[PDB]
Amino acid sequence: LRLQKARATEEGLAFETPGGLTRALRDGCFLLAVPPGFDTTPGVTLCREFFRPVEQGGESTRAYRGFRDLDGVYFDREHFQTEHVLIDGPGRERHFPPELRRMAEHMHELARHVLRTVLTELGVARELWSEVTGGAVDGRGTEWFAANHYRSERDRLGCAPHKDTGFVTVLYIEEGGLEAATGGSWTPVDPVPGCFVVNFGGAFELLTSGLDRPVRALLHRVRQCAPRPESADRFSFAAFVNPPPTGDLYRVGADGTATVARSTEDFLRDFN
Numbered sequence: 133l134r135l136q137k138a139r140a141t142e143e144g145l146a147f148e149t150p151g152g153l154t155r156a157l158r159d160g161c162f163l164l165a166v167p168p169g170f171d172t173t174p175g176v177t178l179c180r181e182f183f184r185p186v187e188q189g190g191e192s193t194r195a196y197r198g199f200r201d202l203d204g205v206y207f208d209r210e211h212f213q214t215e216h217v218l219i220d221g222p223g224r225e226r227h228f229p230p231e232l233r234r235m236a237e238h239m240h241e242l243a244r245h246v247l248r249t250v251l252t253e254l255g256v257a258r259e260l261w262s263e264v265t266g267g268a269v270d271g272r273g274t275e276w277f278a279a280n281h282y283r284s285e286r287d288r289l290g291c292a293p294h295k296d297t298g299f300v301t302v303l304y305i306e307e308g309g310l311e312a313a314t315g316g317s318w319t320p321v322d323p324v325p326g327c328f329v330v331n332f333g334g335a336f337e338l339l340t341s342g343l344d345r346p347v348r349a350l351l352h353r354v355r356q357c358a359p360r361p362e363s364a365d366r367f368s369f370a371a372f373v374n375p376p377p378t379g380d381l382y383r384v385g386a387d388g389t390a391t392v393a394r395s396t397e398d399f400l401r402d403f404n
């Protein structure tokens with residue numbers, strides 16, 4: 133039922149639970165302590181504001197509203213409760229206020245630290261990390277940030293079932309509703325105070341399917357949120373470390389060699 137829990141150290145991940153990283157790789161997810169001094173306020177503010185007009189709200193948070201009017205970053209899902217902002221690095225440079233930019237950067241830093249820690253533990257040669265991940269390990273992949281608002285007034289599922297497409301996702305949640313497919317059933321992934329949820333995506337699963345401990349990409353969904361006042365709607369925000377939009381990645385062989393190449397576009401294609 134319950135997830136492994138770790139804290140990020142300078143050297144990697146210190147797991148406080150017995151299953152350690154081995155169990156977390158099988159689970160496709162684990163709990164990660166929010167680092168000391170990390171400020172979640174910008175993300176919570178964005179999730180309460182991004183879908184409202186700039187004129188409708190206080191002046192102090194004007195930079196957090198009006199994302200419906202930007203081009204290519206706001207998405208209203210027609211058959212689900214979620215509406216969201218999905219934005220890459222250059223978009224955040226142009227459209228996020230500095231404190232929000234800093235928090236997203238800190239979350240991507242954590243996600244890259246997780247990626248490096250798992251590559252270390254699986255025995256991937258240090259000199260091939262950049263090649264194998266298309267530079268995502270060094271912060272030169274596509275680094276997506278998502279802010280999700282679950283509109284509980286919609287009589288729909290919260291979020292479609294899916295696997296994340298990239299390597300590592302660092303997710304902030306405060307409410308139940310997230311579920312993971314284990315066996316032929318959905319299992320709840322509930323929030324734990326003082327923790328992020330971390331999950332792995334399809335690119336990490338593709339990279340490692342031949343290793344002694346393959347990384348599983350978590351198949352997950354969000355169940356329909358029960359109706360409640362909008363100011364108390366379920367929200368989440370997350371940073372995703374993905375391969376770059378073009379180029380080859382490389383599957384890792386049993387002896388640590390970066391072996392066969394895999395096309396990022398054929399991968400995204402066969403994904404969806």
Ligand SMILES: O=C(O)CCC(=O)C(=O)O
Nearest residue numbers: 278280305310354368370
């Ligand atoms: O809201 C959640 O708990 C899940 C969010 C998610 O799966 C995503 O944004 O990719």
Ligand SMILES: [Fe+2]
Nearest residue numbers: 294295296352
């Ligand atoms: Fe997801």
